[PDB]
Design a protein around this ligand. Structure first.
Ligand code: SE4
Ligand code: SE4
Length: 124
């Protein structure tokens, strides 16, 4: 039952009950309480405990939380050499889950390696 914490400005990923995703800096916020369920080695599912919705990635780089379980609910997780974690799309091979430093998620299509934006540290 972890929260994820962005390197890019220190925001936790927030999942809204309506599907909308973003960041906030309030650890006490309930919509930041996640469930990361590993499904194979290195492949996880991050779900919103409260929202009861799964993080999904859309064809256009779009990030949102859906009820439905599909192959877009999936992310190869990864411990970076710097000890931050990364979730890149199992479907959209090149796409990473990311938060802009202002707090809005960043288009998957505009991510890539080397970005702070992509850098997460999960916590209980
Ligand atoms: O982190 Se950001 O907003 O893409 O510069
Ligand atoms: O300004 Se920064 O460190 O490249 O995100």
């Amino acid at each position: 039952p972890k929260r994820l914490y962005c390197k890019n400005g220190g925001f936790f990923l927030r999942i809204h009950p309506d599907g909308r995703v973003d960041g906030v800096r309030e650890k006490s916020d309930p919509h930041i309480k996640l469930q990361l369920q590993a499904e194979e080695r290195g492949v996880v599912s991050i779900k919103g405990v409260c929202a009861n919705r799964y993080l999904a990635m859309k064809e256009d780089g779009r990030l949102l939380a859906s009820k439905c379980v599909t192959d877009e609910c999936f992310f190869f997780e990864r411990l970076e050499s710097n000890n931050y974690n990364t979730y890149r799309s199992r479907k959209y091979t090149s796409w990473y889950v990311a938060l802009k430093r202002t707090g809005q998620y960043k288009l998957g299509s505009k991510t890539g390696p080397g970005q702070k934006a992509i850098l997460f540290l999960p916590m209980s």
